Amino acid sequence: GAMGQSTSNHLWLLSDILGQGATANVFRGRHKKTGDLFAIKVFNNISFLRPVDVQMREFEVLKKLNHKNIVKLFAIEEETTTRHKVLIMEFCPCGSLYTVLEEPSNAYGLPESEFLIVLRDVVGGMNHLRENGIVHRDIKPGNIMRVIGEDGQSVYKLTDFGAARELGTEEYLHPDMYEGATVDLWSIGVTFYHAATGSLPFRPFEGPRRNKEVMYKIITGKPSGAISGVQKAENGPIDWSGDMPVSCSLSRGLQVLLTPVLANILEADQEKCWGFDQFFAETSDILHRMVIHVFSLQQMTAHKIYIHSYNTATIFHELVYKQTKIISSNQELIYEGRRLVLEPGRLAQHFPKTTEENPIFVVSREPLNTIGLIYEKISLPKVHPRYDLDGDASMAKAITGVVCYACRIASTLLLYQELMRKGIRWLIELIKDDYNETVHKKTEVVITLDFCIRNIEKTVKVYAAELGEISDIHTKLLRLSSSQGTIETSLQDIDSRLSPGGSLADAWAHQEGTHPKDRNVEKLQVLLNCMTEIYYQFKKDKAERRLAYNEEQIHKFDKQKLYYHATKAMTHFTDECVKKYEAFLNKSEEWIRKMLHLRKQLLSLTNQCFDIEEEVSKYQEYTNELQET
Amino acid sequence: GAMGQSTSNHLWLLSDILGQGATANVFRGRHKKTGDLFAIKVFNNISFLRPVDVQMREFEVLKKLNHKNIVKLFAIEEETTTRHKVLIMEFCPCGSLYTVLEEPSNAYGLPESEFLIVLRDVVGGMNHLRENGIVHRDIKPGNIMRVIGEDGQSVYKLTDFGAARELGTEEYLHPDMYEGATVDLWSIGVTFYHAATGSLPFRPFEGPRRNKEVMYKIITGKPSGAISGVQKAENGPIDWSGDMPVSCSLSRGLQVLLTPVLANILEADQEKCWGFDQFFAETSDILHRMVIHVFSLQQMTAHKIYIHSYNTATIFHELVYKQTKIISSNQELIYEGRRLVLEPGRLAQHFPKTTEENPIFVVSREPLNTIGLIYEKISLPKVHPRYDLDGDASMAKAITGVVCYACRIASTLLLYQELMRKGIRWLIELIKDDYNETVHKKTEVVITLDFCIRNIEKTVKVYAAELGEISDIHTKLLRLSSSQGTIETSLQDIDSRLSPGGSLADAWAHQEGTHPKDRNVEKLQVLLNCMTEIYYQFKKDKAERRLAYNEEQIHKFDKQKLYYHATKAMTHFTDECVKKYEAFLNKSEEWIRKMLHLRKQLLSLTNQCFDIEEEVSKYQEYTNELQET
Ligand SMILES: O=C(NCCCNc1nc(Nc2cccc(N3CCCC3=O)c2)ncc1C1CC1)C1CCC1
Ligand SMILES: O=C(NCCCNc1nc(Nc2cccc(N3CCCC3=O)c2)ncc1C1CC1)C1CCC1
């Protein structure tokens, strides 16, 4: 209950403070008449700078400017007493991209869906600024607002641009600006890398302090297209990389497209840098693509193939080969219990409905190594007995982010196993289908044969050289009957292999790994909830800047409680989730080999049935079609 | 920052108050040394009542008593100054069953999974009290605590029992106690009905006020086994029902089991009431059953069949018939793209993995009416301009509960449509399989025929009455060839029906209804989030008992905002979700009829192939096996 400023139609408390900037501040405020929430932007220190004439039109420009990706400026009013210039802005309750990246769940990067939303809204908003001719240069997660749309999905809105006339962020600065639309793409690139990785691209050991002199020497090199550079020791060598880290939660399909984009917008040289049209063209090319989910049983890996709606199954096979290394003519698709056949010129529009939980399976003929999920093994940071509020808050974010990652990995392990179980069941049903068809071909052959041998035996029965002619056939057809007999038996051996408890049964898989009923992920989430609660409390303890004797000891206790929670989670993750996954993968390799062996043998047997089929067509007309007047 | 009481090892604020009871109060408190949270029970008004000797042992009993379904009493201590008796109890941060039922999402009953958890924990806890001989009688959602388990699932713990010595809830009172373990089962029954329905079983028009005299006349009748009775007008007739209301979110399978249980524990007569062993036996019988998900394509209805692990497919078919009214020999199962065959003596243990999203489909031969989902059409309560805080809070709960229900129904409509789409695709693939097999039988027949007619034509060719004998066969086999020819053609007509754009294609279904990409449920949830926020704020406004001039107008605004949110949701629910569902159901009926027609015709054609197959076995030996020395 303290004093707050106010304007003829609006009012707000100074206690309610949204963001702090150099020129102005932003407060959570309400309209006087309707009581609706608005972001009130109050200029701090105005006097020398302010123009009645110029800034009038400057604000009159941003007013009528309207878009989905840009925060709406509704009006320009004066504070009641001080007559300060006050902007009435659209309020965004969810905060900004920074607020999103501060969540430990996004410590190692945004989810794929959410990252694409960011890429979409940012590009669209930045492009709308291009169409007006206004430059930003200051694009940072802090000035990228976030709201909840009608459809529940996040919508990102740009803010605070054009201060480059009347008047970039420190780690978002371009090397030369650190010392032209290139500077825009740089802040964009660092932002995009931050959203995908959960970390800045270029990090010195000390940090963005006085010792940030190293940062410039880091940015200066600009080697290759490398998208990141980090020194892991005080004043030492720099580790460069032109690829996303392992902890990244984006798909391989998305990374292959994203890496070049970040590579060309992140360098000092104006020679190798892009332009907004080129950038827009490449980014929009990524956003226009639909996603087909494909699980490779061979390697036990999930894949997101990014395809345009108008592309064909030809380019589809190529992309699948690019990820799974399976040759286009070796890819055998399976969808919902049955194999799937695609015409080489069939469009991507009419592809079957796909989800991560229901992908197009891919089994091959050529043997393949089971890779499984590749993730970065991350362990808990050491916890100090030190009482530092800032240190406790930062550590709380880090250690929770580690558990969030492990929880993420665990959720994927279960998905891989569950898909591995579905694909195996469909495959054995498909192999059973193949056995039945081969049996049908054998029944035809044996009928044709049994009919050719009887007709010839009836020929010698009723009605010198002739008995010699018919005897070659007797010897020939007998050899075919014996071979057909053996084939008939070894096929029943394959049926004995396909029978329940046949040594190719899928009984093992349910046994080997983890199941949704184990509720492993939910157990991690429980501990993650306790940790995230203690985390947000440590944030509020940081905000106070001090604590009472009571809250001091409660803080010291929950800090040790935060540790025991994390250790409990990681122990459960490694002992229960990982181990059972490993064993499932090991027993998956063996079944695959046995499965590949069986299919090869069945193929040979099927080929042999075709051979005896085409060899009895050359005899059933041989003596039965004898000629005379 | 005010005064709070404390004990040698514990301390607490009076501002932090968990629950208020007659004898005692409960505060949120912390341990002095470790700082861990505990529920502190402080006796109010003790003096005349208290026994040093008797109550010592009374508390010494509850101490060592330990269970998963009973709140743990850790110690008995004295307050520092007043020397009041203080119990140190296990703290339950989630609140109680009342707190759970106060959530608008549970306005029309708990979710099925959650209700079963309640039934489980309550029964187990009540039974553990039975084993010790302690009676409760006061069992109410208020004294049934809830905590979050390690596996994320709720765990319910009983509390506050045995006060029937030293010293039930008003609407939870037994008719005679309103004026013996029967009283226990009554409070249980009213509680269980409350959890499943979201409302009390017996409701007068005025309420539980002075005019609650009517309540006794309601309870007094005890007609039949009826589980509920409500008068909809002031001092008028009572509407009785022996079945759950339509708004209930429990499955038909669960209701069939639950209704009798609530029927036998809810009446005045000691003659027709159960006992704890009978109650335990029936409730545990329900809890021991596993659940098989089955979707009936014919009626477009989802089903939860409750089966013991040791039961067989015989009893399974019976239960399916009990719900879907499809005769046991007419039930054709489909699972993951392929039809499923079950041995009549196959146990329930080895049934395929089932979920609501992946059930065993059931298609029939006999025509059936498409019922679809049956739900209660609920509309928004009228909103008063009155400023009453209590009235605003109650109305806020009601109107949000209505939207929660509509959101629930909408989520199910999408599930039904999505399952309807999967079942159709699998069915047409299965019909294609049948077409292919019929084709195979025809190829055999035509080969046998073409081989019998040629051999006979070669007989007349080479080497009075004889030419007459062979001519009957010539005329006979010709008739079979013509009929086989016609069959061969109308089968290709069926193939033309099964071809894409064949008039039995499933193109329509995706077109007719709603899809997950429409994000209808997420849109409702957004509005539901705004409503539930204004709801909880109105609760806090109620708690204050007054508001400042500012908060008064903000309250008045958000009340009108609560209405526009709800109307927006219900409009979207009826116009967008319902309508598109209706049309999908209407176009589902037509496809079903066409599908049933096609299968009948294919059957006749398949039967005709068997006939010409068995009619050529009586001829191919007729003259070719002629006898002579
Ligand atoms: O435009 C700037 N800063 C961007 C951030 C501060 N400005 C704004 N803040 C929110 N809303 C907001 C900002 C932060 C947080 C939250 N949160 C987080 C939790 C709950 C809540 O209300 C909500 N909206 C909107 C805006 C902009 C004014 C249209 C410059 C720095 C000072 C000027
Ligand atoms: O035993 C009784 N009442 C039952 C309710 C009050 N007693 C208790 N309350 C919580 N915890 C509790 C009770 C209510 C609410 C919340 N909530 C809801 C939101 C956040 C929170 O802390 C937490 N635990 C445990 C207990 C019992 C003491 C072991 C009798 C009535 C007075 C004695």
Side-chain angles (χ1 to χ4, degrees), chain B residues 76-92:
Chain B
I76 307 96
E77 308 198 14
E78 288 185 345
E79 204 277 331
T80 48
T81 66
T82 63
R83 294 190 58 183
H84 287 173
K85 300 307 174 185
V86 163
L87 303 179
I88 306 304
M89 308 275 296
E90 160 190 349
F91 176 54
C92 310

PDB file of all heavy atoms in Angstrom, chain B residues 76-92:
ATOM      1  N   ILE B  76       3.613 -36.602  21.165  1.00  0.00           N
ATOM      2  CA  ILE B  76       2.715 -35.784  21.969  1.00  0.00           C
ATOM      3  C   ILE B  76       3.530 -34.844  22.845  1.00  0.00           C
ATOM      4  O   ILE B  76       4.262 -35.288  23.727  1.00  0.00           O
ATOM      5  CB  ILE B  76       1.816 -36.638  22.880  1.00  0.00           C
ATOM      6  CG1 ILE B  76       1.074 -37.707  22.072  1.00  0.00           C
ATOM      7  CG2 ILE B  76       0.841 -35.749  23.642  1.00  0.00           C
ATOM      8  CD1 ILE B  76       1.758 -39.062  22.061  1.00  0.00           C
ATOM      9  N   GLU B  77       3.404 -33.544  22.601  1.00  0.00           N
ATOM     10  CA  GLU B  77       4.179 -32.560  23.349  1.00  0.00           C
ATOM     11  C   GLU B  77       3.300 -31.481  23.975  1.00  0.00           C
ATOM     12  O   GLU B  77       2.126 -31.346  23.632  1.00  0.00           O
ATOM     13  CB  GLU B  77       5.247 -31.923  22.455  1.00  0.00           C
ATOM     14  CG  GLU B  77       6.131 -32.930  21.732  1.00  0.00           C
ATOM     15  CD  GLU B  77       7.416 -32.314  21.212  1.00  0.00           C
ATOM     16  OE1 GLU B  77       7.744 -31.183  21.627  1.00  0.00           O
ATOM     17  OE2 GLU B  77       8.099 -32.962  20.392  1.00  0.00           O
ATOM     18  N   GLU B  78       3.878 -30.723  24.902  1.00  0.00           N
ATOM     19  CA  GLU B  78       3.164 -29.632  25.554  1.00  0.00           C
ATOM     20  C   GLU B  78       3.635 -28.278  25.041  1.00  0.00           C
ATOM     21  O   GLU B  78       4.833 -28.058  24.850  1.00  0.00           O
ATOM     22  CB  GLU B  78       3.331 -29.700  27.076  1.00  0.00           C
ATOM     23  CG  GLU B  78       2.553 -30.828  27.736  1.00  0.00           C
ATOM     24  CD  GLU B  78       2.643 -30.802  29.252  1.00  0.00           C
ATOM     25  OE1 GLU B  78       3.517 -30.092  29.792  1.00  0.00           O
ATOM     26  OE2 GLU B  78       1.832 -31.494  29.903  1.00  0.00           O
ATOM     27  N   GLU B  79       2.685 -27.377  24.815  1.00  0.00           N
ATOM     28  CA  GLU B  79       3.007 -26.017  24.408  1.00  0.00           C
ATOM     29  C   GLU B  79       3.822 -25.352  25.520  1.00  0.00           C
ATOM     30  O   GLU B  79       3.609 -25.635  26.699  1.00  0.00           O
ATOM     31  CB  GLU B  79       1.721 -25.238  24.114  1.00  0.00           C
ATOM     32  CG  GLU B  79       1.892 -24.063  23.162  1.00  0.00           C
ATOM     33  CD  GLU B  79       2.381 -22.812  23.859  1.00  0.00           C
ATOM     34  OE1 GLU B  79       2.076 -22.641  25.057  1.00  0.00           O
ATOM     35  OE2 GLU B  79       3.071 -21.999  23.208  1.00  0.00           O
ATOM     36  N   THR B  80       4.762 -24.490  25.134  1.00  0.00           N
ATOM     37  CA  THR B  80       5.724 -23.897  26.067  1.00  0.00           C
ATOM     38  C   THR B  80       5.102 -23.246  27.302  1.00  0.00           C
ATOM     39  O   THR B  80       5.481 -23.560  28.431  1.00  0.00           O
ATOM     40  CB  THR B  80       6.620 -22.853  25.367  1.00  0.00           C
ATOM     41  OG1 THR B  80       5.805 -21.957  24.602  1.00  0.00           O
ATOM     42  CG2 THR B  80       7.619 -23.534  24.445  1.00  0.00           C
ATOM     43  N   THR B  81       4.150 -22.343  27.081  1.00  0.00           N
ATOM     44  CA  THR B  81       3.552 -21.572  28.168  1.00  0.00           C
ATOM     45  C   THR B  81       2.287 -22.214  28.734  1.00  0.00           C
ATOM     46  O   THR B  81       2.221 -22.530  29.923  1.00  0.00           O
ATOM     47  CB  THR B  81       3.202 -20.141  27.716  1.00  0.00           C
ATOM     48  OG1 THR B  81       2.167 -20.191  26.726  1.00  0.00           O
ATOM     49  CG2 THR B  81       4.422 -19.447  27.134  1.00  0.00           C
ATOM     50  N   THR B  82       1.285 -22.400  27.879  1.00  0.00           N
ATOM     51  CA  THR B  82      -0.031 -22.865  28.315  1.00  0.00           C
ATOM     52  C   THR B  82      -0.042 -24.325  28.756  1.00  0.00           C
ATOM     53  O   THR B  82      -1.014 -24.785  29.354  1.00  0.00           O
ATOM     54  CB  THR B  82      -1.090 -22.686  27.207  1.00  0.00           C
ATOM     55  OG1 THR B  82      -0.746 -23.499  26.077  1.00  0.00           O
ATOM     56  CG2 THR B  82      -1.177 -21.231  26.778  1.00  0.00           C
ATOM     57  N   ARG B  83       1.033 -25.046  28.448  1.00  0.00           N
ATOM     58  CA  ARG B  83       1.136 -26.478  28.736  1.00  0.00           C
ATOM     59  C   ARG B  83       0.006 -27.294  28.104  1.00  0.00           C
ATOM     60  O   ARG B  83      -0.302 -28.396  28.558  1.00  0.00           O
ATOM     61  CB  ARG B  83       1.201 -26.740  30.245  1.00  0.00           C
ATOM     62  CG  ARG B  83       2.458 -26.219  30.923  1.00  0.00           C
ATOM     63  CD  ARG B  83       2.553 -26.720  32.358  1.00  0.00           C
ATOM     64  NE  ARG B  83       2.542 -28.180  32.421  1.00  0.00           N
ATOM     65  CZ  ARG B  83       2.552 -28.882  33.550  1.00  0.00           C
ATOM     66  NH1 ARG B  83       2.570 -28.261  34.722  1.00  0.00           N
ATOM     67  NH2 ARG B  83       2.540 -30.208  33.507  1.00  0.00           N
ATOM     68  N   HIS B  84      -0.605 -26.747  27.057  1.00  0.00           N
ATOM     69  CA  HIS B  84      -1.675 -27.437  26.348  1.00  0.00           C
ATOM     70  C   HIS B  84      -1.146 -28.691  25.668  1.00  0.00           C
ATOM     71  O   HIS B  84       0.005 -28.733  25.232  1.00  0.00           O
ATOM     72  CB  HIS B  84      -2.320 -26.516  25.309  1.00  0.00           C
ATOM     73  CG  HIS B  84      -3.186 -25.448  25.900  1.00  0.00           C
ATOM     74  ND1 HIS B  84      -3.746 -24.441  25.144  1.00  0.00           N
ATOM     75  CD2 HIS B  84      -3.591 -25.232  27.173  1.00  0.00           C
ATOM     76  CE1 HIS B  84      -4.456 -23.649  25.927  1.00  0.00           C
ATOM     77  NE2 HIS B  84      -4.379 -24.107  27.163  1.00  0.00           N
ATOM     78  N   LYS B  85      -1.989 -29.716  25.587  1.00  0.00           N
ATOM     79  CA  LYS B  85      -1.624 -30.937  24.885  1.00  0.00           C
ATOM     80  C   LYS B  85      -1.541 -30.660  23.391  1.00  0.00           C
ATOM     81  O   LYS B  85      -2.488 -30.150  22.791  1.00  0.00           O
ATOM     82  CB  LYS B  85      -2.630 -32.051  25.169  1.00  0.00           C
ATOM     83  CG  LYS B  85      -2.734 -32.423  26.638  1.00  0.00           C
ATOM     84  CD  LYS B  85      -1.364 -32.737  27.216  1.00  0.00           C
ATOM     85  CE  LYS B  85      -1.432 -32.960  28.717  1.00  0.00           C
ATOM     86  NZ  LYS B  85      -0.077 -33.140  29.308  1.00  0.00           N
ATOM     87  N   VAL B  86      -0.396 -30.987  22.801  1.00  0.00           N
ATOM     88  CA  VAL B  86      -0.164 -30.748  21.382  1.00  0.00           C
ATOM     89  C   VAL B  86       0.300 -32.019  20.678  1.00  0.00           C
ATOM     90  O   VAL B  86       1.285 -32.639  21.084  1.00  0.00           O
ATOM     91  CB  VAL B  86       0.882 -29.634  21.163  1.00  0.00           C
ATOM     92  CG1 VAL B  86       1.411 -29.672  19.740  1.00  0.00           C
ATOM     93  CG2 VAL B  86       0.287 -28.272  21.490  1.00  0.00           C
ATOM     94  N   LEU B  87      -0.420 -32.403  19.628  1.00  0.00           N
ATOM     95  CA  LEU B  87      -0.061 -33.571  18.831  1.00  0.00           C
ATOM     96  C   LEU B  87       0.759 -33.159  17.618  1.00  0.00           C
ATOM     97  O   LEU B  87       0.415 -32.203  16.923  1.00  0.00           O
ATOM     98  CB  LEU B  87      -1.317 -34.317  18.374  1.00  0.00           C
ATOM     99  CG  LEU B  87      -2.269 -34.797  19.472  1.00  0.00           C
ATOM    100  CD1 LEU B  87      -3.479 -35.486  18.860  1.00  0.00           C
ATOM    101  CD2 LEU B  87      -1.552 -35.721  20.445  1.00  0.00           C
ATOM    102  N   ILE B  88       1.845 -33.883  17.368  1.00  0.00           N
ATOM    103  CA  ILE B  88       2.688 -33.621  16.208  1.00  0.00           C
ATOM    104  C   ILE B  88       2.341 -34.596  15.087  1.00  0.00           C
ATOM    105  O   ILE B  88       2.711 -35.769  15.133  1.00  0.00           O
ATOM    106  CB  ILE B  88       4.180 -33.742  16.559  1.00  0.00           C
ATOM    107  CG1 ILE B  88       4.515 -32.852  17.756  1.00  0.00           C
ATOM    108  CG2 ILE B  88       5.043 -33.378  15.366  1.00  0.00           C
ATOM    109  CD1 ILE B  88       4.154 -31.397  17.555  1.00  0.00           C
ATOM    110  N   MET B  89       1.632 -34.101  14.078  1.00  0.00           N
ATOM    111  CA  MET B  89       1.106 -34.960  13.025  1.00  0.00           C
ATOM    112  C   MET B  89       1.827 -34.772  11.696  1.00  0.00           C
ATOM    113  O   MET B  89       2.440 -33.732  11.446  1.00  0.00           O
ATOM    114  CB  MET B  89      -0.385 -34.690  12.836  1.00  0.00           C
ATOM    115  CG  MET B  89      -1.200 -34.763  14.115  1.00  0.00           C
ATOM    116  SD  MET B  89      -1.722 -36.438  14.505  1.00  0.00           S
ATOM    117  CE  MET B  89      -2.784 -36.787  13.107  1.00  0.00           C
ATOM    118  N   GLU B  90       1.741 -35.792  10.848  1.00  0.00           N
ATOM    119  CA  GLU B  90       2.284 -35.736   9.500  1.00  0.00           C
ATOM    120  C   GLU B  90       1.554 -34.682   8.677  1.00  0.00           C
ATOM    121  O   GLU B  90       0.326 -34.659   8.638  1.00  0.00           O
ATOM    122  CB  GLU B  90       2.150 -37.106   8.837  1.00  0.00           C
ATOM    123  CG  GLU B  90       2.237 -37.083   7.323  1.00  0.00           C
ATOM    124  CD  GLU B  90       1.868 -38.416   6.705  1.00  0.00           C
ATOM    125  OE1 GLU B  90       1.744 -39.409   7.454  1.00  0.00           O
ATOM    126  OE2 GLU B  90       1.701 -38.472   5.469  1.00  0.00           O
ATOM    127  N   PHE B  91       2.311 -33.808   8.021  1.00  0.00           N
ATOM    128  CA  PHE B  91       1.723 -32.727   7.233  1.00  0.00           C
ATOM    129  C   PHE B  91       1.389 -33.166   5.809  1.00  0.00           C
ATOM    130  O   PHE B  91       2.197 -33.812   5.142  1.00  0.00           O
ATOM    131  CB  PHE B  91       2.651 -31.507   7.213  1.00  0.00           C
ATOM    132  CG  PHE B  91       2.160 -30.381   6.343  1.00  0.00           C
ATOM    133  CD1 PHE B  91       0.891 -29.856   6.514  1.00  0.00           C
ATOM    134  CD2 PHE B  91       2.976 -29.839   5.366  1.00  0.00           C
ATOM    135  CE1 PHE B  91       0.441 -28.821   5.718  1.00  0.00           C
ATOM    136  CE2 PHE B  91       2.532 -28.800   4.568  1.00  0.00           C
ATOM    137  CZ  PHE B  91       1.262 -28.291   4.745  1.00  0.00           C
ATOM    138  N   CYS B  92       0.191 -32.808   5.351  1.00  0.00           N
ATOM    139  CA  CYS B  92      -0.259 -33.148   4.005  1.00  0.00           C
ATOM    140  C   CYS B  92      -0.530 -31.883   3.194  1.00  0.00           C
ATOM    141  O   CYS B  92      -1.624 -31.328   3.253  1.00  0.00           O
ATOM    142  CB  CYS B  92      -1.520 -34.010   4.069  1.00  0.00           C
ATOM    143  SG  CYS B  92      -1.400 -35.435   5.179  1.00  0.00           S
TER     144      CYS B  92
END
